[model samples]
Target chain A: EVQLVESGGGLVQPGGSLRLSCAASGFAFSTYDMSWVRQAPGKGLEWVATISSGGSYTYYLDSVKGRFTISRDSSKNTLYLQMNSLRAEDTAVYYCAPTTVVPFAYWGQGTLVTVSSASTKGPSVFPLAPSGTAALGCLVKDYFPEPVTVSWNSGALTSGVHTFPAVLQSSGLYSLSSVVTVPSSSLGTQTYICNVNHKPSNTKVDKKVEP
Target chain B: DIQMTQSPSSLSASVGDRVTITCKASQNVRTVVAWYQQKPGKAPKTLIYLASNRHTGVPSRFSGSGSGTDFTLTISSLQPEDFATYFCLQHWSYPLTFGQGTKVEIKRTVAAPSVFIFPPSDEQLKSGTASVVCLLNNFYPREAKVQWKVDNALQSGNSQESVTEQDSKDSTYSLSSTLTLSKADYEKHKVYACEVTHQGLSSPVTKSFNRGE
Candidate 1:
C-alpha cells in the first residue's frame, strides 16, 4: 500500500516564487523515480519535471528548463519543486507521481496554485467551406499559464471536432489549435462560433460567422 | 524532440472488447515512452511507462509493449470505464511531445454530450443584434438539459431549444439551442456561458464565450 502526497500550493503573486512538496510512503523512496505533472483548469496534463530516485539525474520540460528546479530529500523520502519568478500563468494544479522507471504511474492528489493577474489571448479564426462542406479552425497562440478552453457552436459540428493538445512554446508561453465541421447543405444562413476562455484571466473570446 | 504519431485516431468498442492502439515515434525513443488515459473533464492518468511495464496498481488487462520507434498499448478486455481517449508521450529528449489523442467510445451505447457555441457573424456582431447558437451532440438515452447565462446570471425566455433525430449508424442523439442577446450586453463584453447536463456524463459540459476581436 504505497501512497503519494502533494502539498504547498495556493495563491502566489506575480514575480514571486514558491515551493511544492511530494512525500511518498510505504515504499523505498530512493529506489523509484518521481515526477511532477500539472493541469490547468480546463487543459490537459503537462510533464513538468522529474528526478531519479537515487538522486543521480534530473530532467525538465524545455519550457521550464531554467525557471523550474526538481530536487529530492532522500533522507525524508520527499521530492521538491522550486518554481522561480512566478507569473499568473504558473497557476495550476501540480501532482507528484512515482514510477518504477521514467514516466508517471501513481499520482498524488494535486495541489492548486493560483497566480494573480494572469492574462489570456484569444484565438485567430479561419473558416473554410471545401466541396460544399463547412469547416472552421481556431488557433490560440502564445498564451501564458494555461488551462484555456476552446469550443465550437454547432452541435452537429461538435461530433467530429478536435482540439490539438496544447504545446509549451520555447518562449515559456502556450499554443493550441482546434477545428470543427458541418455539412455544407445544412449550413444555409447559419452562424458558427468559436469560443476560447481562460478562467485565470477571467477572459473569453467568441468569434462568430460573418455575412 | 521525438514526435509521436498515434493510429486509428478514434474507435468504437464494446464491453469485453479487445482493442490495441499503436504509437510510432519519429526517431528511436528506445523505451522512454508513457501511455495516458483521459476522460472528459478529468486529468489524464498514466497506464504504462518505459514501453512494456504497467504502472503500479493498473489492472492486468492494461498492457504495453514495443521498442525503438514503434510501441503498442492494448486493452485486453475493455471495461465500461475504458471509453475515453488515450495518448502516448516520449521523454527521451527535451521539449516532450504527445500524440494526438485517440478517442475510444462504447459501441451502441450512450456517450457524454459534447457542446459547442457558434459565434455571431461579424456583421450581426457589429450591429449588436447578435444571436449565439449552442449545440449538444453525441449523447444517447434522449435525456439532457441546456442552460444559458450572461456573466453568470441565467437567461430566460429568449432562446429556442429542440432535439434532432439519432444517427442510424451510431444511434446517438443531438440537440440545439439558440440564445438572442441585446446590443447592450454585446457592447458590455458580457461573458456568455452554456451548460449541458446529461445522465451519461459525470459532470455537465460547460462552454463560455465573450465578444471576439
Candidate 2:
C-alpha cells in the first residue's frame, strides 16, 4: 500500500543544478529503501542512485558518481536528489521507487528534465562492399538527449546489421552507428536512403546510400 | 549487472482475450522480479512485484509466475485498457536491468478525456472557503491518473473518487476530483488545475480554473 509521487523537473541550463523530490505515503517510511531511476528519451533505463530510508547508507552509479547527491527526509517520508554540473546529456525522465529486499517494488510516475540548447546531428552514410552485394554504414553523432533511431530503405537493410548501441562520449554527447546490406544487382538506378530520427529535438535526417 | 530479455516483442489482443508475455534472465534471480506496463510518453506502472505478488490495486486477472531465470506474466482476460508495452526487471542483483519490452495492441484504442471545471459560487467565494470539482469523461481503458494543483503546485487537500461508468452505450469511464481551499488561499486568485494522465495521451490533459471564472 505504498505510493510515491515525483515533482520538480523542467528546463535547466548547462552547468546548472536541479533538485527533484519524491514523496511517499501509506507505508512505514523508515522501513524501506528508495532508489532513483532514469530513462533518456527513446533509450533504455539506467539506475541513478539509492538511499536507505533511515538516512544512512548510499549507492550511486559510477557514471553519476561525483555529479549527483541523494538524500532522504524521514519526517516527511520524502526522498531528494540534487544533481550538479549537469550537461544537456542529463536530460531524461526520472522516477523514484521503493527498494526492499531487492529493489523497486513500486515506482513513481516520471518527471522529464530538459537541458536547453542541445540537439542531434546526422545520418551520414558510408559505403561498404560485401559479397555479391553492397553495404551501407550510417553514423549519427553529437546528439544530445539519448535515443536516436537509424533506418534504411531496403527491406533487407531495414533490419540493420551490427547496429552498435548508442554510446555516451566524454563531451556528454551520444553517438550511434549501424550498417545495412543490400543486393548488388540493384545498384544502378537504385537509391537507398538511411534515416536518422532524434525524438528530443524532433529532427530527422536522411543520407542517400551510394554504390 | 543482471540481463533481462522479453520475448514476442509485440502482440495483438482484444477484450476478454488471454495474453501472456515471458521474461528471461541471464542468471538466477530467486523471485526478485517485477512487471510494469508503459504507454507512449507516459511513465510505466507496476503490475506485479516480487515475482508473483500483485501490486496494490492491480486487477486479479493479471498474474505472474516464475523463479530463477524464467518468468511469465499472464493477463487472463485482456481489458480494453490493457493495451500497452510490458517490461520485466530483475532486482536481485546490483545494477538492475530490464527487458526490452513487449507491446500489446488492439483494434480499438483508448480514448482521450474531456475535462470540465466547476468553481465555487459567489457566496462561498466571499466566505473565504471554496470547493472546486474537476470532472473528466468519455475516456477509455478505465486507467487514468488525476492530480490536483494550485498555482502550479500540487495541493494536499484534494481527493479523487473511483472512476464510474458514465453511460452503458459507449462503456466509457468518468471520474471527478474535489479540491478544498481556505479563504486566504482563494483570495489570492490562485489557479486551480487538474492534470490527468493516461496511456492514450502524448501529454497529460491539464485544465485550469481561475477565481470567478
Candidate 3:
C-alpha cells in the first residue's frame, strides 16, 4: 500500500517549539522530495518550506524562517519539518508531500497535530453551484471526496445528471471534478445535496428547492 | 530563481491505470518537493512530495517517489473518475517551483465511500472579540479565496481584502487577509474560522478559533 509516514502529535506551549513528522511508507521515500503544507482549521493550504532527503537544501517561503524547519530521513523513507515560536495560528493540520518532478505529485495522509488545541475540524467540503442552476449545497467543514447525490456540486443541478472532470495544475498533482444537472421542468422541484457519510454510521447534508 | 518546468504539460488517463509525470527545477533543488490535486470549482488537494512523505488517509495506489532534480508520480491503477490535474513542486529553494499538471480520466472503477468530518467538538463561542486573518503560503495556481467565519457561522456584513508578499524569488508569491474585532466582541468569545477557498478539492477549508486573551 502506498503511504506517507507521519508522527508526533502532542501539546505544544505558545511561543514554544514544535515539530511534526510525515514519513513515507511502501514507496521509496528518498525517491521523492518533501514540502511542508499548513492548513489551519478550515483555512486553505499554506506552503511553509521544502527540504531534500539529500540534506543539501532548505527553503522558507518568506521571512517565515523563525517559525519553521524542514528535513528528511532516507533510511526510514520519512520527512520531518519543525516550527518554532509556535502561536495559535500555527496550530493546524500539517502535511508532508513527496513528489515526482513537480513539487508534490503525491501526498501523505495529513497529520492533525494541534498546536494550541486539538484539530477543530477535518477536511472541508463544499458545493460549487453555477449561477441560477437549481442546486443543493452541503457545507462540509472537514472531509474530502465527500459523496452523496452529487459531487462537486456546481450550478443548479437536479437528480440523475452530473459531470465529473479531472484537471492538472502546475504542481503536477490533480484537479478532480464531479457535476450534476437539474431538469428545467423540475428545476424548482428537486433535492440536491453535497454530503459525507462517516463514523456515526449515518451523516448527511442536503438542500431542497423549487426553481 | 531558476524557473521550475514540467513535462507532458497535461494529459488524461483512465482510472486504475498508473499515471505518471515529472517536474524539473531550473537548478538542482535537492529534495524539496510537494504535489497537489484539485477538482473543478474546488480547492487543490495536496497529493505528495511534501517533506518527501505521505499525508493521512491517501489512497495506496497514489504514490510519489523520486529525488534530486528528477522525480516521478505514478498512480499504479487509476480509479473510476480519478480525473484531476497533478502538479510537482520544489520546496528546497525560495520562490518555490511547480510543474504543469496531468489530468486523470474516468473509467469504470470503485468509488470510495464518503467520509464526513464533524463540526468541531462544539465551540463555546461567546462572540468575543478576536483578530482573524488569512495568509497564502503558496502561489501555484495564481488564485484562491479567503474569508472569516464566526462561531462556525460566517461573519455577517464584514469586509474582505487581500495583500501580497514578494519573496527572494520572482515566481513565488504570498498573500494574506486580516480581520479585526473589538474587545467587547472578544468578550463574546465566539469562535472564528478563517476559510481559504480555491480550485482543486470538493470543499473549502477554514481555520477555526475562539476568543483568546
Candidate 4:
C-alpha cells in the first residue's frame, strides 16, 4: 500500500546538476529518512547517500565524499537528493526512496538525467523500501527505440533549483540484471519496489522488491 | 581482506528462468552492500543495494531483495539477449569486496568464468624490485590465455609465468602475474599493468599496479 511516486522523465545537458523528489502520500512523511542513488547510463548502481526528515543528520558513501546532499519538506511529505559537480560520467537515472530506522521500505519510480555537449540546468523532487518476506531483482530494457526525446516527470517546473525530466535512459535494451539477496534480520521486514517511470506514456511502475 | 564466492557462477535461464546470484561476503558486512552487472568493457550496471531496491527505469523482472552476509540478484524473465556476466560489490567498509563474477546464459545454468586478481598493494613490492602475480580463480574446459606486461610490455621467461589448470571445473581458482625489475624496467616504467586475455571475450581488462611497485 506504500507508494513512492517520482517525476516524469527527460534529456539533460552536460555539466548540469539535477534534483528530484520522492512523494509519500499514504504514510507519515516526516517519520522516515530519504536516500539518493545513482545508476550510470548502461551501468549498475552506486549509493550516493541518505538524508533524514529531521534535517539533523546526513550520511554519505565513503567513496562519494562531499558531492551529494539530501533534504525534505515536512508539509509536502517529500524528500530530496541534490547531486553536484555534474560530468558526463554522472549521466544516469537517479532515484529517491524512504528509509525507515532499519532499511529502505518504499521507492519512487526513478528520474533520469543525461549530460549533453552544451551546459544544462539542474533538476529537483519530493519524498518516498524494505527488507522482507520475499525478494526481487532488476533488468532495465532499453525502451527508447531510435532516438526519441526522453524525460522523466511531467510535473511543471517551479522556480528555485527545479529538476525537469528528472530521469533519462537510452532507448532500446539497457543494462539488464537479475538476482536476489538472501533474507536476513538485516533485511528486516521492510518491502522493496521495482521503481521505474516510462516516458511518452508518463506511466509509472512501482513493483515490490520482494520474491 | 575477505574473498567472495558465488554459486552457479553463471546461469542460463529462459526469458523467465527465475535466475538468482548468491554472494557470500568473506567477512560480515553490516548492511553496506551493492550488486552490479558488467558486459565486456562497458561500465558495470548497479542492480541492488542495502540489498533490495531497484535502480529506477530497471524493469520489474530484475530486483535486489536481500541483505547481510549473503545476497542475490534475480532476473524473473530470461530474455534471449539477457546473456552476460554479473558481479557483486560492497562499499560498506574499507577494502570492499567483489565476487569473482557469474555470467547469465540461456539454459538457466551457472558457470564460473575467468577472472584477474591483484596483489595487496604496489607499496609492499616497491623501488623497482616488485613482481606481482595475477591468480586465476577457476579452471575451465580450455587452458586460459594468461600473460603479464609492464606498462603493456609483455614480460618474458619465469618472470612472467601463468599457472596451468589441472581440471576443467576445479571451482577453486587463483592466478598471479609477476613483474621483475631490470634497472631499465623500473627506471622508466610508470605503472605495471596486468593484461588478461580470455577465450570467450575479445577485449581484456588491465589491472594496473602503480610506479612504487
lDDT-sorted candidate list, best first: 1, 2, 3, 4
Per-residue lDDT for A1-211 in model 3, tens only?
Answer: 7676556754465777767877677767675667876555534356778776676888776746857778877776667777787776776667676655555555555665444423222322344332322322232332222222234333433333322222222222222222233444555454555543332214444433211
In candidate 2, which residue ranges exceed 4 Å CA deviation? A1-3, A100-102, A118-211, B107-213
Residue A181 alpha-carbon offset, candidate 1, angstroms: 30
Weakest 10 consecutive residues of candidate 4 chain B by summed lDDT: B164-173
List the candidate numbers ranked by TM-score, top first: 1, 2, 4, 3
How far out, in Å, is residue A16 in model 1? 3.2
lDDT of 2 by residue, A73-121 (tens): 9878889999888887788999998865446667777788877664444
**What lDDT is reached at residue A131 by model 4?**
20
Q: Which parts of model 4 have CA positions greater than 4 angstroms off?
A: A8-10, A62-64, A118-211, B1-10, B14-20, B30-213
* lDDT per residue (tens digit) for residues B25-103 in model 3: 6777666777777553334566664525655546777777766677777677876435656667665656664565554
RMSD list, candidates in order: 13.6, 24.3, 15.1, 20.2
lDDT of 4 by residue, B82-124 (tens): 5567767665653345566787644423233344333323332
lDDT of 1 by residue, B1-213 (tens): 677999879887777989999999999888999899987655567788898888766899999999999999999999877777898988887556778778886667668876667655554455545556676666786778889887888878776665543443365766666565666665675677889989888988888877653
Q: Write the per-residue lDDT of candidate 2 for residues B1-213, one digit (tens) a residue.
A: 688999889876667999999999999999989888877556777788888988877898999999999999999998866877898988786667888889886634578766655565443455555556556655677678888877887766345343443223354555555465666766686678888897778898887877654
Error of 3 at A57 (Å): 3.3
Candidate 1: segments with Cα more than 4 A from true spot: A54-56, A116-211, B41-44, B94-97, B109-138, B141-213
Per lDDT, the best of the predicted structures is 1
- Evaluate model 4: give its TM-score: 0.41
Model 1: lDDT equals: 0.72
Q: What Cα-based lDDT does every candidate model obtain?
A: 0.72, 0.71, 0.51, 0.51
Query: What is every candidate's C-alpha DockQ against the true complex, given to 2 decimals?
Result: 0.13, 0.08, 0.08, 0.02
